[PDB]
Design a protein around this ligand. Structure first.
Ligand SMILES: [Zn+2]
Ligand SMILES: [Zn+2]
Ligand SMILES: [Zn+2]
Ligand SMILES: [Zn+2]
Ligand SMILES: [Zn+2]
Ligand SMILES: [Zn+2]
Lengths: 325, 325
């Protein structure tokens, strides 16, 4: 019975969708992001070159708008973004609640990928403690105002990368997975992150912090971890043509295991290799990028999510996993 | 006027499209491949697992069919594909012509990517000397049965990965590009390859063999060359976090320059950087990959073709370039 919005592919990442703001259901294309905690839309007031082609929010055209206007500034190396807090009806699907978001006023940097893109802004589905201004998560607010029974959502990406993906709010659709769904405890309520013991052949990392991130097409691993593997690889004749390039038929590659106390999650080469050409390619690239984000931290993006249906439960502070069907 | 087939996105590669086979115009999804010289389609007589949701070719239901049945088999490390030669009407757009091609009977390996893919086979568009069975290129054959004036084709990918792209046959639509187009002579009539002098900051490789390949989303570079480049990147503090990862706001990276006797073609960081996430991404990947394919050989994939509208002229043994607009 639940609420399902369709997700679309943009750059090997399938978590883009439509959501509406205000009385007059103004439309935007959002990147639905499990690892951030605000919603961002371009304001009509946006003076910047990148805002041109975008959908705009116009508070004057919506009767439900509630002036807030608290200024916001997020400076990063890739660019900067300023804007204001506004309140209004925010709608995904047949679900609609009054909600505080950020109208983007100016946007320097982040070029050219922002203007080159068909996506207007980001719709965070992370946790409160991470959000600018301590705003309750959107799904929690739906629950607070009895629009849905449980503060849960799920992400289904299809295993053969052709069909439609779904973001579902309010309960669990049995039709997305086979087998039992297993729950893991959130280690802390910042992001959607769990303690797992990560193994990749001979290398391992006990008590790793594993972050789910819908918005990346990549699997990440700390530098030291990847160095360890390169060492195991160098020794016993694991044949590479460059650091990240190998044959698509490479039997001798190890399986990435993420082990909880109750369940093992795996990515076989078949899942962490992208081919250099669509079909009939001799050559394949490791879709694993080594990056030090934070001590002992690993990220799971789409390759993991193309295999595992995932459930995000605020009520219970848990993430659920199961094989997608 | 000239005949135009639309191209669709799959995995950052925009060279997939529609071609018909035979009397009853059986539809397929082809990877139009400029670096191979046969057309391959899955036969109805195809046993294998991966063939199963693929659009098939059926001899018997096409009266223009002309048996050949010559045994063909290609193995690579990625897998095996065998089939038989067959000849029949091969149509793209309005242009139509009897062409010898390959029906794939068995196909081992090339998984999962083949069966996960919505494309059926590869429509070669290279040269005769590279094809199996010494077959005249398709567009050459179009000229041979006086279906087109000139045995030229062109590929347009749009500068902003927004709109659609086109494979245009027999002519040069000038709405696609700006400035003159600049022709380069083929070093060898095998692939569409040219002699260029490659520069990347302080590293260069004179008289490099440079291949144009529509099927790769990547720029490729000899292992040595990339090594020099990273060594260069060492000495004058270019801020790398890992070996292919840097900030998206890093302007201190060199332009990549492909210099011919008459013209210099360039890729800016703007063009060889791909962000880790689709919008507002702090980090970026080097879309340049090292691989020794052959002496001093460099491959130009989609990152290049998105900036350069390209023209492939059999009549003249040349490749032409101009800024896509
Ligand atoms: Zn402007
Ligand atoms: Zn906390
Ligand atoms: Zn362990
Ligand atoms: Zn993210
Ligand atoms: Zn030079
Ligand atoms: Zn190719």
């Amino acid at each position: 019975e639940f609420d399902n919005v369709e997700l679309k592919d943009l750059a090997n990442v399938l978590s883009f969708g439509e959501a509406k703001l205000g009385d007059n259901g103004q439309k935007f294309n959002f990147l639905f992001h499990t690892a951030s905690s605000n919603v961002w839309v371009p304001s009509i007031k946006c003076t910047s070159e990148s805002c041109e082609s975008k959908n705009h929010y116009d508070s004057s055209k919506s009767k439900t708008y509630e002036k807030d206007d608290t200024p916001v500034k997020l400076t990063s190396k890739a660019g900067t973004i300023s804007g204001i807090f506004s309140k209004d009806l925010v709608t995904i699907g047949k679900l609609s609640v009054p909600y505080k978001f950020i109208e983007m006023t100016e946007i320097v940097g982040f070029e050219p990928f922002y203007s080159e893109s068909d996506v207007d802004g980001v719709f965070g589905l992370g946790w409160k403690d991470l959000s600018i201004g301590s705003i309750d998560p959107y799904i929690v607010e739906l629950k607070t105002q009895n629009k849905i029974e449980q503060a849960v959502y799920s992400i289904y990406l299809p295993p053969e990368n052709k069909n439609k993906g779904y973001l579902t709010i309010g309960g669990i659709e049995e039709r997305f997975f086979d087998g039992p769904l297993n729950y893991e405890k959130l280690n802390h309520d910042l992001m959607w992150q769990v303690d797992l013991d990560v193994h990749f052949g001979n290398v391992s990392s006990k008590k790793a912090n594993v972050i789910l991130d819908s918005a990346t097409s990549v699997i990440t691993v700390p530098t030291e971890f990847f160095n360890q593997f390169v060492e195991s690889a160098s020794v016993f004749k694991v044949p590479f043509l460059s650091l990240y390039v190998t044959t698509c038929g490479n039997t001798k590659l190890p399986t990435l295991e993420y082990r909880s106390p109750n369940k093992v999650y795996t990515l076989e080469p078949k899942q962490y290799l992208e081919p250099l050409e669509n079909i009939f390619s001799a050559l394949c690239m490791l879709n694993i990028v080594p990056i030090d984000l934070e001590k002992n931290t690993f990220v799971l993006g789409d390759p993991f999510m193309r295999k595992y249906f995932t459930v995000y439960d605020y009520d219970n502070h848990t993430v659920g996993f199961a094989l997608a069907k």
